[PDB]
Structure 1
Amino acid sequence: SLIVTTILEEPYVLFKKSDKPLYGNDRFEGYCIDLLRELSTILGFTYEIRLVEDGKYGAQDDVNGQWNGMVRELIDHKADLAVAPLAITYVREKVIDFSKPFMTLGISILYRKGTPIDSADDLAKQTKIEYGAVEDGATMTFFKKSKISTYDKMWAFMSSRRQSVLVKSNEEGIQRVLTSDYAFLMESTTIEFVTQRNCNLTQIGGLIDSKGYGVGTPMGSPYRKKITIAILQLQEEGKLHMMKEKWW
């Protein structure tokens, strides 16, 4: 029986709401839970869903070099699989493995409708409107690592206001956009979900980069190849697209 680490994030993973108490895997639903069920059936494994203890996606600590979040769990073999909206990035590929992508996306900007702000550039060159990203996430790590002028500038702004502009979760980021003058750097897939339920919010500009979500495994896992093949099958039969339409 495989240990699967994941994280609460609508509409990928959320607590099923019901009248009666729910236990184990039954507590959860969402796109990634659907995915996990398909993978379990194809590859023929049983599993236990465990929410990542520290509630993080995964980043390397600057000072001690230690990883956190789901990535860390994989590193220490505390989980067999990470099934979640986990971005495939070059820093992560150095320490874990990923299946081929089950979804493609890009960093973009979440802000309110009807403002002059039309790009990351517009944001970088002012200080009135604050902006940030999820702490210890792939988006924050992009900006932290970027050599591109505009993004280095935005990272300088973010790190100096770290206290107020880097959030613990997408939901906190969205809440800031709703309740203050704040633009949120987040993934385009999640933005599409958010703007479908908040008719006063929109995506600003296009995609800042391009990346995929993949299932994470410890480096050298024998499951990576099997999961990659299952994902490509799900993709080709239209099942991933069907799952996205269901949850968005």
Structure 2
Amino acid sequence: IDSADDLAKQTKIEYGAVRDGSTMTFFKKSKISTYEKMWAFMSSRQQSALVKNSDEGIQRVLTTDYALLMESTSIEYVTQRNCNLTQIGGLIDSKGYGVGTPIGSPYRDKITIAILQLQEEGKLHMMKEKWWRGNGCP
């Protein structure tokens, strides 16, 4: 099992994500039948396949057979901080994350030029390295 399709070949391992998740947003707004049927499964029994936060979901992952869907960086960090947990499957979907800005906000230009300065100077690589550092796993 290295993606959701062996969890589409068989469905008896209950799976879900965190409530108000962008993932489930994508599941419901996609017209792919496979991810729509994942949406159908997770909606069932009063939508108990959504969890109020990441931490209860990950600790249910430790004991119950819970296939949990989250973003990449958290998975990488938890794997670097725990070798008793190893991710399952590669990248199921790629989406970019931007900076939240009010609609009509006149602050767009200044923050845009500032982040252009950041990307041309490339300290973002340093801050990615600083916190997402790990020690691997044997």
| TM-score normalized by the length of structure 1 | 0.50
Q: Is the contact made by 1:176 and 1:182 (CA closer than 8 Å) also made in structure 2?
A: yes
- Larger strand share, 1 or 2: 1
- Larger helix share, 1 or 2: 2
Q: Is 1:175 aligned with 2:86? A: no
Report the CA distance shift for 1:162/1:213 in structure 2 as closer, same or farther (over 3 A): farther
Q: Alignment partner of 2:83: what SS?
A: coil
Q: Is the contact made by 1:235 and 1:241 (CA closer than 8 Å) also made in structure 2?
A: no
The structure 2 residue matched to 1:133, chosen from 3, 6, 17, is 17
Question: Which residue of the partner structure matches residue 230 of structure 1?
Answer: 114
1:161, CA displacement in angstroms? 4.2
Give the superposed CA RMSD.
Answer: 1.6
1:236, CA displacement in angstroms? 2.4
Question: Which residue of the partner structure matches residue 126 of structure 2?
Answer: 242
Unaligned runs of 5+ in 1: 1-116
Question: Which residue of the partner structure matches residue 210 of structure 1?
Answer: 94
Report the CA distance shift for 1:118/1:223 in structure 2 as closer, same or farther (over 3 A): same
Unaligned runs of 5+ in 2: 133-138
| TM-score normalized by the length of structure 2 | 0.85
1:182, CA displacement in angstroms? 0.5
Q: Alignment partner of 2:87: what SS?
A: strand
The structure 2 residue matched to 1:191, chosen from 48, 63, 75, is 75
The number of residues matched between the two structures is: 132
| Match runs of 1:77-226 below 5 Å | 117-161=1-45, 163-226=47-110
1:125, CA displacement in angstroms? 3.0
Q: Is the contact made by 2:51 and 2:57 (CA closer than 8 Å) also made in structure 1?
A: yes
Q: Is the contact made by 2:3 and 2:92 (CA closer than 8 Å) also made in structure 1?
A: no
Looking at structure 2, the residues matched to 184 and 162 of structure 1 have their Cα atoms a distance apart, in angstroms, of 18
1:15-54: CA deviation from partner (whole Å, max 9, x where unpaired): xxxxxxxxxxxxxxxxxxxxxxxxxxxxxxxxxxxxxxxx
1:132, CA displacement in angstroms? 0.7
Report the CA distance shift for 1:235/1:171 in structure 2 as closer, same or farther (over 3 A): farther
1:144 partner letter? K
Question: Which residue of the partner structure matches residue 65 of structure 1?
Answer: none
